[PDB]
Amino acid sequence: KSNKINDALNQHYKLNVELGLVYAHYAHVADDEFDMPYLGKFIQHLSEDKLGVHKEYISDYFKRNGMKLKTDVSVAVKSIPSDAKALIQEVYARENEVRDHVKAIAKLALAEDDYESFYFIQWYVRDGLKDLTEVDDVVKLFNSSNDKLIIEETIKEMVEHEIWG
Amino acid sequence: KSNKINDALNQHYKLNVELGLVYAHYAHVADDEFDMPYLGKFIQHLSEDKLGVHKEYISDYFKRNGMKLKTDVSVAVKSIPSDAKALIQEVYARENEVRDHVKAIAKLALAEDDYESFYFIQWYVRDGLKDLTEVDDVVKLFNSSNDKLIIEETIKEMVEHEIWG
Amino acid sequence: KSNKINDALNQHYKLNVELGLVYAHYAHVADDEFDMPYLGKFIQHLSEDKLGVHKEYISDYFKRNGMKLKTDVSVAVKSIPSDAKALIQEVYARENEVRDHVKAIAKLALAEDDYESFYFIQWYVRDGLKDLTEVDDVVKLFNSSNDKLIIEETIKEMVEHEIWG
Amino acid sequence: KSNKINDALNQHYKLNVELGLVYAHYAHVADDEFDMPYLGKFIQHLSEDKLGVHKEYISDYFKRNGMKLKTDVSVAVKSIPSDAKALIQEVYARENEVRDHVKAIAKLALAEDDYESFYFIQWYVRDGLKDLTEVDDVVKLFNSSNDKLIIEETIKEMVEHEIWG
Amino acid sequence: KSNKINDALNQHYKLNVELGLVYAHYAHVADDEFDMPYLGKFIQHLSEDKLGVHKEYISDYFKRNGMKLKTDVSVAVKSIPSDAKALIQEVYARENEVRDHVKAIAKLALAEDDYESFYFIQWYVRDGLKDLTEVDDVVKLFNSSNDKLIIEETIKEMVEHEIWG
Amino acid sequence: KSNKINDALNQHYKLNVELGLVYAHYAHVADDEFDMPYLGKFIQHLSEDKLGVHKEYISDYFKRNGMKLKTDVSVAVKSIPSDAKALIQEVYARENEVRDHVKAIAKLALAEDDYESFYFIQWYVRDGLKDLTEVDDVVKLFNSSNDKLIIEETIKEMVEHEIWG
Amino acid sequence: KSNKINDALNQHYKLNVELGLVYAHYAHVADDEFDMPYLGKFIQHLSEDKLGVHKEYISDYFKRNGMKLKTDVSVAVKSIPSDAKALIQEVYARENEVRDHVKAIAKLALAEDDYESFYFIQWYVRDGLKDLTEVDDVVKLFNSSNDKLIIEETIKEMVEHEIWG
């Protein structure tokens, strides 16, 4: 059992918990302040994704290989973006960092010859791009229409691939 | 819109987020270290309950009445109980404090003549006792059997009322 | 976004387009000149496979990661093999080169620490062997029978694995 | 078997292969750069139409009447239109040339007294106008709305006649 | 085709044949001598797993890539563990060595740039942990109960994940 | 409990394990080297028959009557037959020896007045002829056709009696 | 018609009648005195088996071959075992004697060249071991648990093979 991999996956657990809490807030704001209930529903689904299987897969993995789970959570949402476009744009930036963190864990697993963790992280390698694509498909509506309700309608159909999930 | 009620419900949101994160950890430990997968499943369900509708009902309420959501989360799980009995016993203590916090919000709503918040909190008044009963039904198995697998089997049937939900 | 990976996958796109066009022709010839309609049907299915998802997966990948699609196609079918055995034997040689090209992209993704492209190419790593096995199962009929219609019948049942697809 | 008709239909085969490859690219661009996934889906369907039955009907015809298939493909997509309107406008121009090429083959079949090829081309005479109408119904959305997502929505319903097919 | 990979997978074939034969015996003993028919059923299923797809996947792989199958089997069960706990504990030790052997093959495939064998072994990388988890869930019953029939009952329900199979 | 019968059935267990391992290899060879996938499927089914119920019935019998199971397996496949006809011919020779070994156990059970083992072996008396008939029906195809694919087709229908099972 | 076989089967009839009457009593005692209703149900089923088809098959056989039925029944249950373990242990001893008596009839049929009676007794040869296995599976619960209700539960699932019936 690799201590560097244990640390990196504990880091990734933390990231998914805190991110999901930030998105929970961002979802509330999307509906309440920006008056976009469907954008909020899209961001709530991202939040429950991060606080669900993104963290559960790590703790299930630890039960199996002997690694230690660490719960150290610190998050405060102290400024909100100014409009809805900025808000989804901020989600996108956060999801791009996910792909960076995930790529670091994959590199580390190969360096440690941890092939069970390289296998395990392949899920996150794939989901890193899928969640970014979904967010990106939304950031793009704001560049195609000046009408919130046109955008809102298009998001709704998004909520209501053999390689990328 | 009452600022004291806004503050108390932001406090209760925080409590449910942090508690659910603690239970997520306690669930991992119940299965991994104490070798009780069904107790973990019981505690995972409590965790998803706290991090789900317990926090969502508060933020939905705020969208409607004008109150402000605050996300300020700080939780670290720095010691684990020594055995499974102690672990569920600690969950019970935490759920008893829930009923205390909930009773304070109900008292406050009447004092502020906030009848929409008194109505809104009635759910939490009821769920405060129901979640405590469920936890209590588990703490009690540990006083009735010295056999982990007997207990484990009984918990399983718990996972697989017109007043209390 | 890696420029060497962008170039290699643009190369692989080109290969699949041009190959599929060659097989389209080889399928026509299998039925018209060699009087083997089912061998043609087998080779038509390979052609539509190459000109379908083999190229679509690359362009879908580029939409997601930012890489640039390049369409530069040059193919002329200037000599046909002399008999049906030679024809399927030539398909086999072409599919063996696919596995070589695919292995080069996998090696490159690891060298560039492009783990999303290493994941993405795993599909092609697997399909490289599967398409070669299918072709090989046909090249083998021609070593087991001197009778075109016996072979034709066996191919027909081929048209009418948990690791290899 | 007419050599002038063999040549003209080999020319038309080439046209459909190369066109379909251009549209495959134009479809990628419609979604990736112009942020119009449904326009891309419309153009992908045109691409698979051209690289499918438009070329297969010619090669099936050749099997029957004795004509020779020639595969000589050269296409490079070296400039893309500047916006989505221009892009579908370019598809339209290309489809108008199809009707010109098809009309030349029909005229030639009558001049050669090739009534099987005059019959055979009637399909292409009809499809020449149908594909142009479909493209035209899309070029027209861009003259009726300044909103990409309004247009995108209308295209979607187009994707989701007793004379013209 | 790599000779070092051919040798390592022939080694892994041998391991799975011999292991499955040992487990067949261990299953008989679990029921006959230790009077635990369900533990025997659990170990019989492991035996048929090892002597089934664990060896068949290797020989199917060899048909495709050109490697040579070698059948050299030598196994004698000369001492049995003293009780049922020791017996499942011995299975666990044997399954931990599986993960070591599998990790060596994955490392070797990357060193040889054998990406088809790295892909092929990913199955075994995953199954290495899954079979160990299943065995581990049984070794753990013996630390939770002094009662064979309590344990026997719990095993029965085990016989009657998106990452780990 | 007869020690001579215990020894003879331990001998027969060994025979079925080792034989099944030889057939597993012979099945691989039938498909890979001799290019006869259906003959391999026929021989794989014989292999799983020998390594399945042929050995399980013996160990189940021992649980009931008190006899001791012995696992002592030694088999190496050091030469393969030269063609497919020889290969199935070798299976036939091996199955004829089965009937000899089985007849010896039946004779021994009567001599020992072991009527439960005489009953038990009646299954093997019957299956001895049935498995030989099935193999024989295949050895006979090779004397009726010079065409591998004709034979292959006939074997396929064999894979896709009130006295003999 | 053999008089020695007629006598031996009349003896076996007597044995099954008297045994079934003893088990009827043992079943009553298992539930009433030892407080184990499911053990009683297991022993009642043995009783009805002995007083049913075990005696009916003999009298049906006599109708066919000419032998004479004799009803001479004498049984008194004058001491009961001290606990439930002893009680099922006594059933086991009685069933082992069944196999001895049955083996004597099989030997006698061969010595008399009574092949219809050797055939007829094969049923009893087989059932001799099956009934002993079932009883044995119960005697074994008492060596695996000190808890009557654990045992009782396991027996219940026993009440709620191609060679042995």
Ligand SMILES: [Fe+3]
């Ligand atoms: Fe991280």
Ligand SMILES: [Fe+3]
């Ligand atoms: Fe708000």
Ligand SMILES: [Fe+3]
């Ligand atoms: Fe800290």
Ligand SMILES: [Fe+3]
């Ligand atoms: Fe590293």
Ligand SMILES: [Fe+3]
């Ligand atoms: Fe290394």
Ligand SMILES: [Fe+3]
């Ligand atoms: Fe996700």
Ligand SMILES: [Fe+3]
């Ligand atoms: Fe992600």
Ligand SMILES: [Fe+3]
């Ligand atoms: Fe709609």
Ligand SMILES: [Fe+3]
């Ligand atoms: Fe809709």
Ligand SMILES: [Fe+3]
């Ligand atoms: Fe709709």
Ligand SMILES: [Fe+3]
């Ligand atoms: Fe709808």
Ligand SMILES: [Fe+3]
């Ligand atoms: Fe619907």
Ligand SMILES: [Fe+3]
């Ligand atoms: Fe609807």
Ligand SMILES: [Fe+3]
């Ligand atoms: Fe509170």
Ligand SMILES: [Fe+3]
């Ligand atoms: Fe742990």
Ligand SMILES: [Fe+3]
């Ligand atoms: Fe703070």
